[PDB]
Amino acid sequence: VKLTAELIEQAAQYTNAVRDRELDLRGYKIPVIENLGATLDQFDAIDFSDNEIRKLDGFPLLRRLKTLLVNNNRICRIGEGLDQALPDLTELILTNNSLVELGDLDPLASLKSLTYLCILRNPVTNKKHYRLYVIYKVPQVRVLDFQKVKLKERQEAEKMFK
Amino acid sequence: IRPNHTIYINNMNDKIKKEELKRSLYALFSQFGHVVDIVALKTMKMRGQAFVIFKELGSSTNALRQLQGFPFYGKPMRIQYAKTDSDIISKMRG
RNA sequence: CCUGGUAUUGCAGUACCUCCAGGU
């Protein structure tokens, strides 16, 4: 069940609860993110929850995409050119995925508008200094794992890793 | 209070602006199923609370058990099944 | 809107939403 143009065209399309245009791509068992061209850059949000995607990569240039819900997939790596295809990405929800090393979260530093980030229920979470590492390497984030990035944490992350 | 499509949350940090609260609520609760809508006001009466509505009932029950006391913006949230059925649910059913 | 501090534990359908001081 390839993510195909035909698949996207019959997919529930609606205005979500936070007033954004969202496309519903839940529970299709998609393994690879591809063929997004067919959405025609018409969505503010794309819901990819409960699928089998391994890597957050493969996006076309999508100027309107601001929210990516990627819950319960198998994300173990993040693509390197994400800001070049998603310039205004502001919210990224990665709860319950497979990111294991702090260094695998490095590609998120290039998403200049990224403000809401959630990486809960990922092995990487239990790594020593996981929170400070994210704060220093992705300073554009204001809310991390539903907790406010505070000044004291920023300073503390400036010492360690300076 | 029987299982319900809508969950009632209280004990929330009322300093978060309304639109940010609703967007984080949506994000957090999307992991269990499609959230149809969220009702949250900052009036004196309703501040620190929110109603989260899900398409599927199993999603509401799972959310309730798994996020009971989850630290959200600094406080442990308290979740419960809503007393009544949500207007949106009643309209979607009949 | 942003810092501090402070009140409120309340079952809803929303112009907006505690108050106090400081910053814009």
Side-chain angles (χ1 to χ4, degrees), chain A residues 1-83 85-111 113-127 129-141 143-149 151-158 160-162, chain B residues 1-54 56-94:
Chain A
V1 54
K2 198 187 213 288
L3 163 44
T4 230
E6 300 83 2
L7 179 32
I8 286 173
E9 284 154 14
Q10 53 82 73
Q13 194 164 151
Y14 46 66
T15 302
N16 70 34
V18 293
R19 299 175 58 38
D20 283 347
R21 291 287 297 176
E22 171 167 331
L23 172 68
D24 186 353
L25 289 175
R26 276 207 202 227
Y28 285 101
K29 284 168 175 305
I30 292 153
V32 167
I33 291 166
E34 54 180 353
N35 300 317
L36 284 183
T39 61
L40 293 170
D41 199 0
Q42 297 195 2
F43 301 100
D44 295 301
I46 297 183
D47 195 342
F48 281 105
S49 300
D50 313 311
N51 278 295
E52 281 157 27
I53 299 158
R54 280 149 229 197
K55 187 182 175 163
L56 201 66
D57 196 62
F59 300 83
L61 154 76
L62 284 176
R63 297 196 136 285
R64 189 177 175 181
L65 191 81
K66 292 172 282 271
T67 288
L68 260 174
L69 302 177
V70 206
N71 293 300
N72 327 316
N73 285 261
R74 270 166 206 199
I75 302 300
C76 56
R77 261 172 221 199
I78 307 209
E80 299 289 0
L82 273 184
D83 76 326
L86 314 178
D88 211 54
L89 189 57
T90 298
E91 157 182 320
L92 178 62
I93 313 295
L94 279 173
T95 320
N96 185 37
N97 273 282
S98 288
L99 293 165
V100 320
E101 303 178 358
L102 290 191
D104 291 310
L105 307 183
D106 291 341
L108 302 167
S110 83
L111 287 145
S113 21
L114 192 67
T115 307
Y116 302 99
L117 180 56
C118 173
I119 315 188
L120 293 169
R121 294 173 74 195
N122 280 251
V124 72
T125 260
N126 304 310
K127 267 192 190 177
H129 312 310
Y130 153 81
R131 194 180 175 71
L132 287 311
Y133 186 87
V134 177
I135 290 170
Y136 170 92
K137 194 94 183 187
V138 195
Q140 56 270 45
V141 161
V143 184
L144 167 67
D145 296 338
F146 310 104
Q147 315 293 324
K148 256 197 133 158
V149 170
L151 170 69
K152 308 192 224 184
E153 306 170 75
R154 310 251 188 202
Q155 299 161 343
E156 300 172 9
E158 185 63 349
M160 187 176 298
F161 306 122
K162 205 168 165 180
Chain B
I1 304 170
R2 306 154 46 214
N4 186 338
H5 272 66
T6 300
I7 52 173
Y8 167 74
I9 307 165
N10 70 2
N11 197 48
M12 287 193 308
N13 164 352
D14 59 28
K15 302 218 88 137
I16 308 303
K17 318 152 218 148
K18 197 166 71 176
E19 304 300 355
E20 196 190 313
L21 177 70
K22 288 190 155 214
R23 176 187 195 155
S24 306
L25 281 168
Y26 186 72
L28 179 60
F29 290 108
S30 54
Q31 74 195 275
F32 303 104
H34 191 234
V35 181
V36 165
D37 194 29
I38 303 170
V39 187
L41 291 92
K42 295 280 218 99
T43 50
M44 229 58 217
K45 176 157 173 215
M46 295 311 296
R47 69 190 295 99
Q49 301 156 87
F51 284 86
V52 169
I53 309 167
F54 289 94
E56 309 297 338
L57 169 46
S59 281
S60 181
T61 300
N62 281 343
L64 174 101
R65 309 201 169 172
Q66 299 253 285
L67 296 185
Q68 190 61 258
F70 177 83
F72 186 67
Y73 288 95
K75 327 181 61 144
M77 36 164 66
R78 165 171 28 175
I79 300 168
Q80 292 160 61
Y81 288 118
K83 283 186 191 306
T84 71
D85 258 77
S86 283
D87 299 335
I88 284 137
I89 299 295
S90 295
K91 271 167 181 290
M92 194 175 163
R93 278 180 190 183

